[PDB]
Design a protein around this ligand. Structure first.
Ligand SMILES: *C(=C)C1=C(C)[C@@H](Cc2[nH]c(/C=C3N=C(/C=C4\NC(=O)[C@H](C)[C@H]4CC)C(C)=C\3CCC(=O)O)c(CCC(=O)O)c2C)NC1=O
Ligand SMILES: *[C@H](C)[C@H]1/C(=C/C2=NC(=C\c3[nH]c(C[C@H]4NC(=O)C(C=C)=C4C)c(C)c3CCC(=O)O)/C(CCC(=O)O)=C2C)NC(=O)[C@@H]1C
Ligand SMILES: *[C@H](C)[C@H]1/C(=C/C2=NC(=C\c3[nH]c(C[C@H]4NC(=O)C(C=C)=C4C)c(C)c3CCC(=O)O)/C(CCC(=O)O)=C2C)NC(=O)[C@@H]1C
Ligand SMILES: *[C@H](C)[C@H]1/C(=C/C2=NC(=C\c3[nH]c(C[C@H]4NC(=O)C(C=C)=C4C)c(C)c3CCC(=O)O)/C(CCC(=O)O)=C2C)NC(=O)[C@@H]1C
Ligand SMILES: *[C@H](C)[C@H]1/C(=C/C2=NC(=C\c3[nH]c(C[C@H]4NC(=O)C(C=C)=C4C)c(C)c3CCC(=O)O)/C(CCC(=O)O)=C2C)NC(=O)[C@@H]1C
Ligand SMILES: *[C@H](C)[C@H]1/C(=C/C2=NC(=C\c3[nH]c(C[C@H]4NC(=O)C(C=C)=C4C)c(C)c3CCC(=O)O)/C(CCC(=O)O)=C2C)NC(=O)[C@@H]1C
Ligand SMILES: *[C@H](C)[C@H]1/C(=C/C2=NC(=C\c3[nH]c(C[C@H]4NC(=O)C(C=C)=C4C)c(C)c3CCC(=O)O)/C(CCC(=O)O)=C2C)NC(=O)[C@@H]1C
Ligand SMILES: C=CC1=C(C)[C@@H](Cc2[nH]c(/C=C3N=C(/C=C4\NC(=O)[C@H](C)[C@H]4CC)C(C)=C\3CCC(=O)O)c(CCC(=O)O)c2C)NC1=O
Ligand SMILES: C=CC1=C(C)[C@@H](Cc2[nH]c(/C=C3N=C(/C=C4\NC(=O)[C@H](C)[C@H]4CC)C(C)=C\3CCC(=O)O)c(CCC(=O)O)c2C)NC1=O
Ligand SMILES: C=CC1=C(C)[C@@H](Cc2[nH]c(/C=C3N=C(/C=C4\NC(=O)[C@H](C)[C@H]4CC)C(C)=C\3CCC(=O)O)c(CCC(=O)O)c2C)NC1=O
Ligand SMILES: CCC1=C(C)/C(=C/C2=NC(=C\c3[nH]c(/C=C4\NC(=O)[C@H](C)[C@H]4CC)c(C)c3CCC(=O)O)/C(CCC(=O)O)=C2C)NC1=O
Ligand SMILES: CCC1=C(C)/C(=C/C2=NC(=C\c3[nH]c(/C=C4\NC(=O)[C@H](C)[C@H]4CC)c(C)c3CCC(=O)O)/C(CCC(=O)O)=C2C)NC1=O
Lengths: 164, 177, 160, 46, 161, 407, 49, 177, 177
């Protein structure tokens, strides 16, 4: 969990010091910024089944070839797993807004993803067509607040920068 | 290691849930007294060089066979290590008070301390009293009822952080028992 | 079956079984040869009895399969026929048990709670079983069609 | 045939009686606190 | 069967003292959330069938407890579930209004895990169903109200475990 | 090819971290590289010095009061004319490395300490040690370490820029090389003064013998037992803090284990293991009752497709369409989320959770029956009539010795 | 009338309470007293009990 | 580690014998079908990156709780880790088929995999299901009865090497159980 | 520890203030010399951290074959277990000194110790040396004739408590012989 606490108690623990004033000041930022980034953790949680539904079909509207036989989305079970994975990436973004950093993404979704998407022959460009559709469907003062749309998008295209 | 934010993440992963409106009231109340927690860690780390000599020397005046020859605080190198693990434990408890969860206590301080103290031949019951004087001091500093140094504070209730730091020292005193 | 509830009837009454009860357990077991033949006909006709069963069901209730219907798409329509395979199976149990006791505690008790809680129109599934009944009785003689159809309409009655 | 079978009788039953032993509401067999400890032989001072 | 006011009065009475500033301090805290709990219990009463339909379809609808051999196969057994899930969503509504989970273990929790083991009901699938039911309940009543209603769901899940 | 190249080949041109270190336990915890920058602040020189003292001394109390031979070897490094490889060579030639890990150590304990300190790993096979035994006895200790860090191992996996660390390298060339790794680098607490027992044999904690365990595992092919690789263990320190449904962390060993509790637990884990082997042959085809009609309900439902939004007007009402990839198959949000709820609701997974949960309860209950003669028992159960007999007179199992005195 | 005592059919079908318990709870129910208690006199309620 | 020639040498060095003509009838027959062994192990290595994804995901379709949160093949680290030991085992079996002797499998791949997989919480019955799918594929590619790919081969029998690679896969099943 | 002197229960709702049906006459009679006994156990357990380390190193430096390799105290697990068992034995004499009778010692500590030490190869001739040092150590501490440490007791006599605790140590020492 790469967060604002676990950088100031991982660098102090490697240094062997008590949490000084440089590390109590860093968690004062975890009180001002977290008023906004939990609002984007709450709107994304209460509307998650409609976001992935509006986002996961843009994977197949853009790439219509996936329903061909032999390809990745060829039958019923493989289409449901493709909508499952965008629900996973929308869940870790809800986990990353409530942690405070990119902790649940760099450990649980990103690390090892370039080795499973090459082995199982999944196109990783099809994943970022679904996430970048979600970044551009974001109306900034309608979906959430102005600041919570900054926090929600900055974990979204970080996940795009991880997959590409 | 985890904190109080990511303890309810891996609890909400065990349920394959989003962190919705039920769990965020547990965390928005956690940042509501976020100024209270940093006022509680600052009472610990400002006296932390004096609390470790207050607590190791309280163990000596109770069990004086440690400084007896053949003991475990007799050799002067062996005394200087016992002042070190009084404050490495206080370094990892103060991280656990800062993070709000005792994972870094469980996974770094107590990760093998029990078979360490057997294999060094350290008396374990005196390691309880080295820990538990720091429990009775930190609940005196956080409640600001230390009998010779009062710190300035905005007034109000603080007894949840007192029992939280008393819960982290037991987690130490039970793992090395 | 007729054997188990003719017992539990006389069980509750603190008595043994009368001639009226024992001349029918007797009459039922001699009927057992003819029952297995009837259930044997429906056993390996489930491909036609179900698929033609859902044939008339969609022609009579296009709403349930149209967009917005409960059984819409490739997915629900497969489960749309799955339930008919269930109820066709329970009728084979009732024919061999000589009673709707197998159909009673499976697929009938509290069936309205399930289908109301699934969003399925319970009247629609009743229409499906009626379409299966005409296919089933068309596969048997008149003496048999008075039985195989006889268990369907009981399922029709309890399903509304 | 499924491993986690169940309880009950009549049709829709897995061949296992109700409650795994025909008792729906089982009378308990434990003792109270202090003589569950008295039988253990380890909580003697307690 | 005590609410927040009953529990406050009991603890203040059990020492034989009057309602001091600390006892009334929590009572004022309960009256502040009195407006939130009724609206939370309002919408849950309206969408009772919809919430249970959403939870089972989201947690255990297509798993093999639903298929033959699974713990939920026959229609009597399926119908017992939504009857059974109705109590969890209903009694949790009572705890949300009373502000005290005493009614749950009084009327739900005691003899519950000992009963499911008798019937052979899977406690593992039961708790997610309640976890999924807790997830949809936070959708309706909002965040903080979901935090309140959610605080009694996991109380059921904890004791039922 | 999931992993293209190991960590023993150097990282080629196009990565900042090697491919095995991305998805191993490298990224989770504090066993990472803290490679020195080019020019650096004396605070950042103290950061790379404090990691060297943690690594090559193995959490030993270095007693900063003295640092006697250290501050010449520090000041060669703080200038920059000593490499981090040449600092960690020079620390392994001093007296305060000799009086800790050489003056009391067996030559098995010394070689297994140089593998943990200088390299990352454990010793893999037997003749890997037998090189370093014969290199010490013919060339001496100063020419041992010089012939130990200048092979092909150290210059690829750390270079001359980074400090050593515990090498969670993913591909382990015996499988026990992960087991002896985590048994040597024993958690975040234990040092090698503790692990070799140099304090308890010491005369007032000084000049004691650094004896060794695991000498029976380097001679014969024998794995490490699992309690030393799961309890006092660096995997607890670089723990993912998951929800792992078989929890890998071992329970503490219970007081008052009974044979009546084990003898039903072994029958329970044989009951689930015989029921798992039956249910796994029927999986994924006959357990799916909706699978048999997918060939027909998929072609019955391919009639009157709607290309824009709006049709299926159905007698003149709206009743429109969704036209996505999901809802053209009729699926919902409760149709891809049904995979996440497949622990309670599954049947094959229902067995394999409680198989590994009760075997893990068995492997700490059976291993707590290593205590026999003065152990005070108790009867926590209600002393029921179920009792296995003590019929152990004649041969019942008798493992096949066809060569009884074959000569 | 589609009436339902799901809690009582619960606690009797499992055997958690007797038929006598299920009968007594039916008597103290409100669907009972609306049926055979409210429209009658305490005199007539005793005989109908 | 050994091979098929040097297995009979340490068998003959236990009685200090020369390698005579009565022993060498197996080894002269070993190079007589030495074309077939390279023709066999080419078919596994040319399909090895799809053999693992056929098998680890074939374990998933039999036990679908592993992809649920909690099951040991859920996170993208864990799936890339489970695919990684899917091809470590397939590498060493193809090493063992090539040398014709199971020594390189049992001192380098399987020596201590059982105690490793206990420590990580990897379920040991599911790894037999990953191995037995790779057991049924390696006997399919060698006998060229794979139902969606045929490769070109000279005409003749091959079922001895199908039996030998079958016995190198049940050593993996017996090591970790 | 706390069963060694019976207490009185004065409040209601107890079942022992009213329907006690007894007062414990064997243990009231031991508060008739109770302060002198409680100073004697306090004389032992304030030096119990030093008495066990002196006595175990006493038999090491008189019989030096135990710390030789091949001996029964060379390795670290055996050296930690030997310091543990003298500490456990010194606790159980301090139960029996406190309770005033040896009936706690013979079943919880001595019942099945001679069969244990021959089942582990523990030298029984050397372990009786280790308790005779602690027999000689405890009579110095109770009579306050220790050379390097005195304690400020009251003015009185403590023989026939020193010979009471010396009668427990050979009762240990013949139960393992
Ligand atoms: C090595 C060959 C060797 C020893 C080591 C040493 C051990 C030893 N000591 C005694 C006698 C006593 N030991 C005592 C213990 C202590 N004295 C203290 O003040 C501190 C608190 C504590 C040690 C940490 C005491 C009180 C005595 C009694 C004598 C006295 O009044 O000091 C013995 C036994 C001697 C005997 O039985 O007569 C041994 C073996 N002595 C060594 O020779
Ligand atoms: C969807 C728009 C894609 C697509 C997806 C598929 N993914 C398949 C399997 C799969 N996906 C993941 C990653 C995912 N699972 C997780 O648990 C997490 C987060 C922790 C993520 C991101 C894994 C690990 C796996 C393998 C195991 C499994 O879930 O089955 C998959 C099945 C592959 C197959 O059966 O061959 C598909 C079809 N593929 C598409 O069609 C579009 C491009
Ligand atoms: C003092 C309160 C104790 C006591 C302590 C001794 N510890 C000695 C060495 C030592 N101490 C620790 C504890 C600490 N260091 C860590 O790194 C961590 C966790 C991250 C902790 C909690 C360790 C690990 C070690 C071993 C280190 C080493 O020596 O290499 C020690 C000296 C032994 C010696 O020098 O031989 C002492 C005396 N002993 C006591 O009696 C009180 C109770
Ligand atoms: C309980 C342990 C104490 C106590 C705590 C209270 N602290 C309160 C306010 C407070 N403390 C700080 C400083 C703290 N925040 C930081 O960001 C840093 C370092 C970077 C520190 C040390 C602040 C900023 C505040 C907020 C008010 C202010 O502007 O100073 C407080 C008031 C309520 C609240 O704000 O939560 C309490 C009750 N007070 C006590 O009586 C015990 C001893
Ligand atoms: C996959 C089909 C399994 C499964 C596997 C997991 N293995 C994990 C780590 C791991 N795997 C191995 C085996 C392999 N690596 C080797 O180096 C050698 C021989 C030299 C072999 C046979 C090892 C040694 C390790 C530990 C290495 C490491 O993790 O750094 C693993 C990750 C657990 C974690 O990250 O904590 C998984 C998930 N899991 C499954 O469910 C199927 C059955
Ligand atoms: C058994 C698994 C197969 C099969 C095997 C046969 N292979 C036969 C001959 C053969 N294969 C090769 C190529 C091989 N030798 C090499 O040196 C290399 C790589 C550098 C490879 C891939 C050669 C050279 C030959 C010899 C004849 C030729 O020159 O082509 C063969 C014929 C008998 C024999 O020569 O051993 C058989 C039966 N054929 C099968 O039917 C299954 C599927
Ligand atoms: C040191 C003064 C001795 C010596 C001691 C060893 N004892 C070993 C094991 C052991 N000791 C006991 C008895 C102890 N445990 C109790 O629970 C009680 C009373 C309540 C007593 C007195 C037991 C039951 C055991 C076995 C179980 C255990 O390990 O605790 C031991 C280990 C033997 C070995 O590992 O080989 C040692 C070395 N042995 C000596 O040589 C000196 C004289
Ligand atoms: C938690 C994150 C979260 C979001 C980011 C949004 C994302 C979002 N918006 C819409 C849906 C919509 N979004 C918009 C807004 C706009 N349309 C535009 O083209 C403009 C850029 C912008 C004006 C501000 C409008 C007008 C609709 C309704 C019609 C439509 O789909 O475009 C939908 C489809 C479901 C629905 O109708 O709500 C989704 C998922 N909702 C969420 O819950
Ligand atoms: C025989 C030797 C012996 C001692 C040295 C003292 C040591 C001592 N002090 C405290 C108890 C305490 N100890 C301290 C410590 C300190 N006070 C400060 O202001 C400084 C920060 C630090 C000294 C540098 C504090 C703050 C308390 C809590 C109460 C208070 O003093 O205000 C306790 C725990 C309570 C108790 O057991 O009594 C002990 C053992 N007592 C002894 O019996
Ligand atoms: C739940 C999902 C699921 C799967 C993924 C497969 C997995 C799978 N494949 C095979 C059986 C096999 N699996 C393969 C593997 C492959 N075929 C190729 O040509 C490629 C190289 C590679 C896919 C990339 C081969 C070659 C066989 C032997 C038969 C054949 O396909 O010709 C078997 C054993 C026999 C069987 O049950 O069919 C299993 C379980 N089956 C499933 O039920
Ligand atoms: C043996 C007695 C018995 C029955 C009958 C039974 C029914 C049953 N029907 C289901 C679903 C379903 N059933 C239908 C049915 C229909 N749609 C229509 O339009 C038609 C009117 C109707 C069929 C003729 C649909 C669409 C679903 C899926 C609903 C959803 O996905 O939300 C499900 C949930 C998925 C499953 O586990 O199969 C069950 C358990 N179970 C039983 O044990
Ligand atoms: C108010 C507190 C309270 C509770 C909770 C309660 C539960 C309860 N659940 C029951 C059965 C049941 N409960 C279930 C439930 C499930 N099957 C699954 O797979 C799921 C995991 C789960 C749904 C979430 C089923 C299938 C039965 C029928 C068992 C049978 O016929 O053997 C029964 C037996 C009698 C009956 O239902 O009439 C009782 C008494 N009683 C109470 O008084």
């Amino acid at each position: 969990m790469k967060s604002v606490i676990t950088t100031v108690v991982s660098a102090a623990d490697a240094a062997g010091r008590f949490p000084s004033n440089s590390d109590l000041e860093s968690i004062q930022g975890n009180i001002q910024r977290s008023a906004a980034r939990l609002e984007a953790a709450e709107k994304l949680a209460g509307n998650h089944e409609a976001v992935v539904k509006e986002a996961g079909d843009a994977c197949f509207a853009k790439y219509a070839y996936l329903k061909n036989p032999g390809e990745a989305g060829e039958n019923q079970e493989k289409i449901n797993k493709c909508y499952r994975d965008v629900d996973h990436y929308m869940r870790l973004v809800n986990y990353c807004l409530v942690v405070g950093g990119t902790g649940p993404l760099d450990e649980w979704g990103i690390a090892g993803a370039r080795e499973v998407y090459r082995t199982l022959n999944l196109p990783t460009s099809a994943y970022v067509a679904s996430i970048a559709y979600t970044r551009d469907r974001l109306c900034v003062p309608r979906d959430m607040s102005a600041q919570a749309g900054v926090e929600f998008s900055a974990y979204l295209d970080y996940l795009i920068n991880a997959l590409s | 290691m985890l904190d109080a934010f990511s303890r309810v993440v891996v609890n909400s992963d065990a349920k394959a849930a989003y962190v919705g409106g039920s769990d965020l009231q547990a965390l928005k109340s956690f940042i509501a007294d976020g100024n209270k927690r940093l006022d509680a860690v600052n009472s610990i780390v400002s006296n932390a060089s004096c609390m470790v000599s207050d607590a190791v020397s309280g163990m000596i005046c109770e069990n004086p066979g440690l400084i007896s020859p053949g003991g475990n605080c007799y050799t002067n190198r062996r005394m200087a290590a016992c002042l070190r693990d009084g404050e490495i434990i206080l370094r990892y408890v103060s991280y656990a008070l800062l993070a709000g969860d005792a994972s870094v206590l469980e996974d770094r301080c107590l990760n093998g301390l029990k078979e360490t103290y057997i294999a060094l031949g350290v008396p374990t019951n005196s390691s309880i009293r080295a820990v538990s004087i720091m429990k009775a001091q930190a609940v005196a500093f956080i409640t600001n009822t230390a009998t010779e140094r009062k710190m300035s504070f905005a007034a109000g209730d603080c007894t949840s952080l007192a029992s939280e730091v008393a819960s982290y020292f037991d987690r130490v005193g039970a793992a090395i028992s | 079956s007729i054997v188990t509830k003719s017992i539990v009837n006389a069980d509750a009454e603190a008595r043994y079984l009368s001639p009226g009860e024992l001349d029918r357990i007797k009459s039922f077991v001699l009927s057992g040869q003819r029952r297995l033949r009837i259930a044997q006909t429906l056993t390996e006709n489930r491909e036609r009895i179900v698929k033609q069963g859902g044939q008339q069901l969609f022609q009579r209730r296009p709403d349930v399969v149209s967009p917005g219907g409960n059984a819409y798409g490739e997915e629900m329509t497969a489960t749309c026929l799955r339930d008919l395979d269930y109820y066709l199976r329970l009728v084979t149990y009732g024919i061999i048990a000589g009673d709707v006791t197998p159909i009673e505690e499976i697929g009938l008790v509290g069936v309205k709670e399930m289908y109301s809680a699934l969003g399925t129109p319970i009247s629609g599934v009743a229409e499906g079983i009626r379409c299966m009944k005409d296919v089933a009785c068309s596969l048997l003689s008149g003496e048999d069609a008075a039985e195989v159809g006889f268990y369907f309409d009981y399922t029709l009655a309890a399903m509304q | 045939r499924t491993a986690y079978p169940y309880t009950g009788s009549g049709y829709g039953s897995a061949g296992v009686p109700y409650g795994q032993d025909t008792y729906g509401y089982k009378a308990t067999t434990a003792k109270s606190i202090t003589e569950t400890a008295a039988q253990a032989g380890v909580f003697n001072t307690f | 069967m005590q609410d927040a006011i009953t529990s406050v009065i009991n603890a203040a009475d059990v020492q034989g003292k009057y309602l001091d500033a600390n006892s009334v301090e929590k009572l004022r805290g309960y009256f502040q959330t009195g407006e939130l709990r009724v609206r939370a219990a309002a919408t849950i009463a309206a969408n009772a069938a919809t919430i249970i339909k959403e939870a089972v379809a989201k947690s255990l609808l297509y798993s093999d407890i639903t298929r033959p051999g699974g713990n939920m196969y026959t229609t009597r057994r399926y119908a017992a579930c939504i009857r059974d899930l109705d109590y969890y969503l209903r009694y949790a509504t009572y705890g949300m209004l009373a502000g005290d989970p005493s009614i749950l273990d009084e009327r739900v929790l005691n003899g519950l895990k000992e009963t499911y083991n008798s019937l052979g009901v899977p406690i593992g699938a039961t708790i997610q169903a309640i976890q999924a039911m807790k997830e949809v309940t936070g959708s309706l009543v909002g965040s903080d109200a979901g935090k309140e209603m959610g605080l009694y769901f996991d109380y059921i899940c904890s004791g039922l475990s | 090819k999931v992993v293209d190249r190991l960590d023993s080949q150097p990282s080629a041109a196009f990565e900042q971290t090697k491919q095995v270190y991305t998805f191993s336990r490298y990224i989770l915890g504090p066993h990472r590289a803290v490679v020195a920058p080019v020019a650096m602040d004396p605070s950042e020189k103290e950061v790379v010095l404090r990691a060297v003292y943690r690594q090559v001394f193995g959490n030993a109390y270095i007693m900063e009061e003295e640092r006697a031979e250290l501050r010449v070897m520090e000041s060669q490094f703080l200038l920059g004319e000593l490499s981090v490889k040449e600092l960690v060579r020079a620390l392994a030639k001093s007296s305060t490395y000799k009086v800790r890990f050489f003056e009391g150590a067996v030559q098995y304990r010394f070689i297994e300490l140089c593998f943990k300190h200088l390299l990352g790993r454990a010793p893999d096979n037997h003749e890997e040690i037998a090189v370093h035994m014969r290199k010490y006895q013919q060339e001496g200790y100063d020419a041992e370490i010089d012939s130990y860090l200048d092979a092909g191992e150290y210059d690829n996996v750390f270079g001359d820029d980074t400090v050593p660390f515990l090498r969670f390298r993913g591909v382990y060339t015996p499988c026990d090389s992960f087991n002896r790794q985590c048994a040597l680098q024993g958690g975040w607490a234990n040092s090698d003064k503790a692990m070799g027992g140099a304090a308890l044999s010491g005369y007032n904690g000084s000049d004691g013998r650094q004896m060794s365990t695991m000498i029976g595992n380097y001679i014969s092919g024998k794995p490490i037992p699992y309690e030393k690789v799961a309890a006092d263990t660096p995997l607890k320190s670089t723990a993912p803090n998951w929800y792992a449904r078989p929890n890998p962390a071992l329970a503490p060993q219970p007081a008052y284990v009974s044979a009546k509790e084990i003898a039903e637990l072994r029958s329970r884990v044989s009951k689930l293991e015989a029921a798992w082997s039956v249910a796994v042959k029927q999986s994924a085809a006959a357990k799916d009752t909706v699978e048999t009609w997918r060939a027909a309900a998929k072609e019955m439902a391919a009639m009157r497709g709607i290309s824009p939004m709006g049709e299926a007007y159905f007698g003149g009402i709206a009743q429109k369409v969704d036209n996505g990839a999901l809802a053209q198959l009729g699926n919902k949000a409760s149709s891809y989320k049904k995979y996440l709820y497949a622990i309670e609701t599954d049947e094959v997974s229902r067995l394999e959770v409680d198989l590994e949960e009760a075997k893990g309860q068995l492997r700490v209950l059976e291993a707590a029956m290593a205590k026999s003669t003065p152990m005070t028992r108790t009867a926590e159960f209600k002393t029921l009539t179920k009792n296995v007999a003590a019929v152990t007179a004649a041969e019942k199992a008798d493992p096949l010795s066809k060569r009884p005195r074959i000569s | 009338y589609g009436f339902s005592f799901s809690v009582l059919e619960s606690q009797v079908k499992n055997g958690q309470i007797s038929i006598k318990e299920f009968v007594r709870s039916l008597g103290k129910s409100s669907v009972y007293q609306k049926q055979f208690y409210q429209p009658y006199v305490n005199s007539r309620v005793v005989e109908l009990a």
